[PDB]
């Protein structure tokens, strides 16, 4: 336990039919709330939004209490994302999934402000611009990524959303990731068919845009054209990305890759290092990062969290994790939950709280 992490809570709060027996609902996404005041980093945020089944929960990591819950019959929520708006700061929570609708929650006030019918198919994931807090990307099974401006809320807390760009994908988009050094100019997306970069500059005049560069990670025909289901920046230049069935997380340089590009629409990335991850062929284990601590985080099919401190690596063969945080088999209904999978793992920016979501209707909360 080199990172000195301890399990704090295992919350069963997305249960179907309000049942204590639900140890099966898949939890799909989680996101720490920003600071509640402008100018604060929010790095020690201890409030996390989670979604799964018909529900979005907002949880205090410290106490484990569910502060807020939003439930929509017949929805299946796949993605949550926060944005800090200036109205005084309002922390808005966007939630979406099966129904193709973005539901904008004013959490503190206790209600859903507005709903955007963004797609006619499910939304796989949502992502706000870090710099233009009203700009929202929605990625859908209709093989589009749409960039929205949700606008300012009117006096009665209503939003009038407009469409800024449509990004056309050759396969379903799974994971969104703005380019760290130019997040309103280029967007990365991990898709069922690999990882791409789209030009999202609004000063270019085309409104429907195909991928500018499709990336290549391996010359192995066994992996060519395979999904990229985890994608995040470890620091301003270095991207961590992965697919399934490869036992590997790739660390690559945005700047060196982009510099090599020219006009090529298909481009091998400049790889900096490769990390050993689980060998599972199972799909949709996403990764995340904690840049301030130089960490990559990725759950696996046994419910472990692989943790990599890549500082020394990136300053100077598959590299091993720094720590593998095993599933601690907490007791439910008096019996150990001996098996689960952790498909999403997210830490606050200071790495004082870590949340690991399972396929067992359990939100795992660890403290450092």
């Amino acid at each position: 336990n080199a990172l000195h992490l301890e399990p704090l809570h295992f919350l069963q709060c997305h249960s179907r039919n309000n049942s204590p027996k639900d140890l099966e609902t898949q939890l799909w996404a989680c996101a720490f709330e920003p600071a509640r005041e402008e100018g604060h980093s929010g790095a020690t945020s201890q409030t996390v939004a989670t979604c799964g089944g018909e529900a979005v929960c907002v949880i205090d990591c410290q106490t484990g209490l569910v502060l807020h819950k939003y439930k929509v019959p017949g929805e299946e929520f796949f993605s949550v994302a926060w944005t800090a708006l200036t109205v005084k700061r309002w922390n808005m929570l966007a939630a979406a999934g099966l129904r193709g609708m973005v539901r904008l929650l004013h959490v503190r006030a206790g209600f859903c402000c507005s709903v955007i019918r963004a797609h006619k198919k499910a939304i796989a994931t949502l992502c706000f611009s870090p710099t233009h807090e009203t700009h929202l990307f929605t990625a859908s099974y209709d093989k589009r990524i749409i960039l929205w401006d949700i606008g300012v809320p009117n006096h009665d807390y209503k939003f009038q959303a407009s469409q800024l760009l449509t990004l056309n994908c050759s396969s379903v988009p799974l994971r969104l990731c703005p380019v760290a050094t130019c997040p309103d100019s280029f967007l990365l997306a991990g898709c069922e068919g690999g990882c791409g970069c789209w030009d999202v500059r609004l000063d270019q005049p085309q409104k429907q845009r195909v991928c500018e560069v499709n990336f290549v990670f391996s010359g192995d025909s066994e992996v060519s054209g395979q999904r990229v289901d985890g994608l995040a920046f470890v620091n301003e230049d270095v991207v961590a990305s992965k697919g399934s069935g490869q036992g590997t997380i790739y660390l690559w340089s945005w700047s060196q890759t982009w510099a090599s590009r020219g006009s090529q629409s298909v481009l091998p990335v400049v790889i900096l290092a490769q990390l050993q991850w689980s060998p599972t062929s199972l799909a949709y284990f996403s990764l995340s990062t904690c840049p301030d601590k130089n960490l990559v985080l990725c759950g696996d099919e046994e419910g472990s969290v692989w943790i990599y401190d890549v500082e020394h690596l990136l300053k100077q063969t598959l590299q091993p994790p720094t720590q593998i945080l095993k599933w601690p088999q907490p007791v439910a209904l008096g019996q150990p939950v001996t098996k689960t999978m952790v498909n999403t793992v997210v830490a606050n920016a200071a790495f004082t709280y870590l949340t690991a979501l399972t396929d067992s209707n359990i939100v795992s909360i660890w403290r450092r």
């Binding site: 249960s15 206790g110 209600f111």
Partner: peptide
């Protein structure tokens, strides 16, 4: 090791409404 804590709808502190 904490056990799994069930949080039912009546245990939530606040429900968000439409």
């Amino acid at each position: 090791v904490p056990s799994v804590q069930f949080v039912g709808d009546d245990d939530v502190l606040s429900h968000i409404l439409d």
